[PDB]
Design a protein around this ligand. Structure first.
Ligand SMILES: [Cl-]
Ligand SMILES: [Cl-]
Ligand SMILES: [Mg+2]
Ligand SMILES: [Mg+2]
Ligand SMILES: [Mg+2]
Ligand SMILES: [Mg+2]
Ligand SMILES: [Mg+2]
Ligand SMILES: [Mg+2]
Ligand SMILES: [Mg+2]
Ligand code: NA
Ligand code: NA
Ligand code: NA
Ligand code: NA
Ligand code: NA
Ligand code: NA
Ligand SMILES: [Sr+2]
Ligand SMILES: [Sr+2]
Ligand SMILES: [Sr+2]
Ligand SMILES: [Sr+2]
Ligand SMILES: [Sr+2]
Ligand SMILES: [Sr+2]
Ligand SMILES: [Sr+2]
Ligand SMILES: [Sr+2]
Ligand SMILES: [Sr+2]
Lengths: 140, 186, 95, 160, 154
RNA sequence: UUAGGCGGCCACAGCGGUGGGGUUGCCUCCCGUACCCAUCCCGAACACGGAAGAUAAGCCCACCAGCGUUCCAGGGAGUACUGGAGUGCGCGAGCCUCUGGGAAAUCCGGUUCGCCGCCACC
RNA sequence: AGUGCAAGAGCAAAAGAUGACUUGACAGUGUUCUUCCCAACGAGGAACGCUGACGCGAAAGCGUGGUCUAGCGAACCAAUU
RNA sequence: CCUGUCAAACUCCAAACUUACAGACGCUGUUUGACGCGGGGAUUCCGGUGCGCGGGGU
């Protein structure tokens, strides 16, 4: 039981919201894999009329590429309670967010006969703090 | 769910198992659907005809009963898929079925995928199905060359139970061979 | 009326009841009829192509052959006989 | 104008404000009256006023009656007596007047009325067994300013 | 088996009603017909409910009438036992009368005109502006009432 | 159907919940990228190859009615409305009688936590 | 929500959004309905076929313009093929 | 939560009723030939009233 229930990270997204780019470089260096541009919707009085146009970038880290980045990422931040997602996710910031969830998650991300995860199998803020905390750092 | 004005999707759509929009286009041809479906360990290939209470299955072919003829290898690969196709293609040939349209379900039209490889077997069995040659995988990957040359990158057996270390795509030929036999109890 | 367009005053007849919203089943858009068969004309709001003139909803016609995949149903408007071209999606076998 | 012009029900229901404009505001100032914080069950007596014929009541009639009606209770029971009267109807029907000749006759919106089917309760008071006669007199006045004849019926009152 | 009797003229009566009457083989005021009792036959009388007098007659009366007002399919020949017997699968009026009521045959099936052309009610009827319940003569009747009329219209 | 594939009707099938279920069997989660294929960045997905592990999800099985829905009982109600008729009543708006039909809201009590088709299969 | 524009209607693994490819907004000839309920009447319109040629797709298939209902015009004369 | 009211251009509901086709009974037609088909000749295209349902207008 405990095994197929014990958490893990599915993806760590690093993103810089700018609004007009040259910032890609650093992420390619710090993560270890290419980045991707960010667009937007709706005109913005802040001279943000052009709808589809570069505004930021991001990178999704999976498996090692993710951990290896976290070993250094996590330390650089002071984690708090009000910094957690009801689904066991946390963002802090250059932004760095982490998507955590129990084993059989593919069930929802696949194509064929997918299904949403029962509120029970959903990770909890608590179960999140624990798992993470139990990996080189403190809570509170 | 919420109230009366609410709209609950057709069951088979909730379940996310049938793509009706695509289905319709299929159903139009009038020809029977050559249902091709995968599974982690298996591969099925049904030949469906339309009915008054629901679809009818005039001829199937499961990768499991593929061993029933002498298959000692796995049941979720190209060699597997092809064969299963040719098997159902034959059985169907035994029901009066002559043509069909490939129904790859919710799978993807990827080039050389097991589905097209399944479709290739039913064609070879004698059935008439609208296809696209250059979308099918190369005769070898159909055999198991892609996998055999993988065990070449040995150091650790490609398999658990011993079917063999280097694997025998020849076996593929051996089985295929056994199917073109008139006798063979279908 | 105020306009003499085909859909004039057809809000009611050409609209699905809430729970009948969205795409329709394919089983009946493929139904095969036989020449002579009596069929009930009723447009499927969810279906767009293969519709006969609204004025004919409720008519019970007799399939007298088909054109393409669509059917050529025979009906009688008042006293004048007409040949209506409709697709299965808008037909139901009588009885 | 005379109530004769809009007392019967003969036009189609006309209330879609989304299509009507220049609709005059209601002359009614209060539908809830008396001690509107208390409750209807807090009283022994509950006397309502029933309209005997189905009609239309222009807001000027409702207010005109409701006024002189309640104004009595305020007099005989004090501007803070122990009662609570209510006017359950509201002026929804919009009324027009064609004010030229019969050409392009559709009128211009001039008022609002409340359609009250015969046998319904226009008003409903809630008083203590004592002021029951001051409420009956409060209605005798009110039914003199609406078009139909009425009945003063007791909904809860064994005290007689 | 019911006795239908038109008591109201044709002028101003709806056409679909008058058409029904003629379908029930009744073409003039005071004409009478003996109609079975099926769903179909019910719908019709129901629809004519206002320009007719109906109900089930007593075997007795039905005879009194048949005697006095039945006619061949063509002719003056009086329909009397002899006549009845010489042409009808029966032996006498009572014989016929019983079948009609039991609903086994029809005046037509025998060679009798579907209509029994009665005579104005002697002493007048109870009026055509109200049903039987309101004291009039229109609508369904009491086997006794029906007779009272048919009797009076010998 | 000791867990499968394709369906028809498309909520009686929804929403929410409880309990049980898997050694070479099934479905999965799962393990892994040499290839076919793949991601405007990610073997996440898609695709391919494979079983060290698991029954915690999913799924299948049994059950729960609180919400939603289907049908039924009784009450509302033969009330509202209404096709036909009237030398019936009313100043009138309108009402009534006779005849043939006949709701809706709501309340209480049951039902409903899907049904059926073809194929494959200890 | 969006879907160019009135209103009513259709649409969610799409009819909406994004990407790419593409130009079927192609040639020609019909059936039917509409225009004109019933019931005769032109232009215009629509659905539905067939022949030829194309576009996309693995394929079924989809494209005779924009999801449906408005955006339209006789003869004579002129130009043009 | 509790409480007070509405809708020609609102609808989770919903008639009576009208209406397509078929069967049955009725009625009608096969010397009075219906149903239908072709042809000749019209008149007519100021209507009115009662009742039911209406829309406008005191
Ligand atoms: Cl599959
Ligand atoms: Cl049409
Ligand atoms: Mg309407
Ligand atoms: Mg005679
Ligand atoms: Mg006398
Ligand atoms: Mg008299
Ligand atoms: Mg369990
Ligand atoms: Mg009078
Ligand atoms: Mg020119
Ligand atoms: Na639908
Ligand atoms: Na003028
Ligand atoms: Na870009
Ligand atoms: Na499980
Ligand atoms: Na034309
Ligand atoms: Na005229
Ligand atoms: Sr009026
Ligand atoms: Sr003048
Ligand atoms: Sr008065
Ligand atoms: Sr993986
Ligand atoms: Sr008078
Ligand atoms: Sr008066
Ligand atoms: Sr009844
Ligand atoms: Sr279109
Ligand atoms: Sr009508």
């Amino acid at each position: 039981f405990h095994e197929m229930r014990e958490p893990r990270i599915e993806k760590v997204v690093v993103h810089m919201g700018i609004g007009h780019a040259n910032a890609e470089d650093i992420l390619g260096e710090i993560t270890g894999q290419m980045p991707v541009r960010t667009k937007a919707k709706r005109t913005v009085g802040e001279f943000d009329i052009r709808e589809g146009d570069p505004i930021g970038a991001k990178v999704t880290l999976r498996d090692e590429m993710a951990e290896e980045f976290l070993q250094t990422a996590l330390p650089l931040a002071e984690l708090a309670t009000s910094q957690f997602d009801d689904t066991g996710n946390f963002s802090f910031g250059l932004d760095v967010t982490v998507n955590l969830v129990r084993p059989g998650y593919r069930v929802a991300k696949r194509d064929k006969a997918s299904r949403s995860i029962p509120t029970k199998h959903r990770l909890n803020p608590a179960d999140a703090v624990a798992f993470i905390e139990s990996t080189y750092d403190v809570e509170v | 769910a919420t109230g009366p004005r609410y709209k609950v999707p057709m069951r088979r759509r909730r379940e996310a198992r049938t793509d009706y929009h695509q289905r319709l286009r299929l159903l139009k041809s009038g020809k029977p659907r050559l249902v091709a479906r995968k599974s982690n360990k298996h591969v099925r290939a049904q030949l469906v005809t339309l009915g008054p209470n629901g679809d009818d299955t005039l001829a199937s072919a499961h990768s499991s009963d593929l061993a029933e003829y002498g298959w000692e290898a796995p049941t979720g690969n190209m060699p597997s898929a092809y064969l299963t196709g040719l098997l159902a293609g034959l059985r169907a040939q035994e029901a009066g079925v002559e043509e069909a349209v490939l129904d790859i379900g919710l799978n993807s039209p990827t080039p050389g995928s097991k589905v097209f490889a399944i479709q290739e077997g039913a064609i070879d069995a004698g059935l008439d199905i609208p296809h696209n040659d250059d979308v099918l995988a190369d005769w070898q990957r159909t055999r198991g060359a892609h996998i055999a040359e993988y065990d070449e990158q040995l150091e650790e057996p490609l398999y658990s139970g011993d079917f063999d270390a280097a694997d025998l795509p020849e076996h593929f030929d051996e089985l295929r061979e056994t199917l073109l036999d008139g006798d063979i109890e279908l | 009326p105020s306009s003499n367009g085909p859909l004039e005053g057809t809000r009611g007849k050409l609209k699905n009841k809430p729970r009948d919203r969205g795409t329709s089943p394919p089983q009946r858009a493929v139904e095969e009829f036989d020449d002579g068969e009596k069929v009930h004309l009723k447009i499927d709001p969810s279906v767009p192509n293969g519709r006969f003139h609204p004025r004919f909803d409720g008519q019970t016609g007799t399939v007298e052959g088909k054109q393409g995949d669509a059917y050529k149903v025979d009906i009688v408007d008042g006293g004048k006989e007409k040949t209506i071209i409709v697709t299965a999606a808008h037909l139901r076998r009588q009885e | 104008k005379p109530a004769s012009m809009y007392r019967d029900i003969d036009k189609p229901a006309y209330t879609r404000r989304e299509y009507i404009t220049g609709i005059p505001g209601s002359k009614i100032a209060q539908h809830k009256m008396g001690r509107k914080q208390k409750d209807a069950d807090d009283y022994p007596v509950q006397i309502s006023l029933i309209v005997e014929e189905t009609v239309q009541l222009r807001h000027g009639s409702l207010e005109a009656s409701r006024l002189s009606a309640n104004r009595h209770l305020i007099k005989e029971l004090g501007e803070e007596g122990d009662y609570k009267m209510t006017l359950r109807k509201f002026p929804h029907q919009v009324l027009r007047e064609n004010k030229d000749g019969m050409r392009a006759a559709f009128g211009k919106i001039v008022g609002t009325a409340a359609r009250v089917q015969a046998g319904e309760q226009l008003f409903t008071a809630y008083c203590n067994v004592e002021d029951a006669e001051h409420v009956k007199e409060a209605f005798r006045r009110a039914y003199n300013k609406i078009t139909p004849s009425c009945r003063i019926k007791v909904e809860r009152g064994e005290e007689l | 088996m019911h006795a239908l009797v038109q008591l109201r003229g044709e002028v101003n009566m709806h056409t679909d009603i008058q058409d029904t009457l003629e379908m029930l083989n009744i073409h003039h005021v005071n004409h009478c017909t003996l109609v079975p009792e099926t769903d179909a036959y019910r719908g019709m009388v129901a629809k004519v409910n206002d320009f007719v007098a109906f109900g089930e007659p007593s075997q007795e009366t039905l005879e009194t009438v048949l005697a006095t007002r039945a006619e061949p399919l063509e002719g003056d020949a009086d329909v009397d036992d002899e006549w009845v017997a010489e042409h009808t699968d029966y032996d006498d009026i009572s014989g016929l009368a019983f079948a009609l009521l039991s609903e086994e045959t029809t005046l037509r099936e025998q060679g009798l005109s579907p209509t029994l052309r009665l005579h104005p009610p002697r002493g007048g009827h109870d009026g055509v502006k109200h049903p039987v319940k309101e004291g009039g003569q229109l609508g369904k009747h009491d086997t006794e009432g029906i007779d009272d009329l048919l009797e009076a219209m010998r």
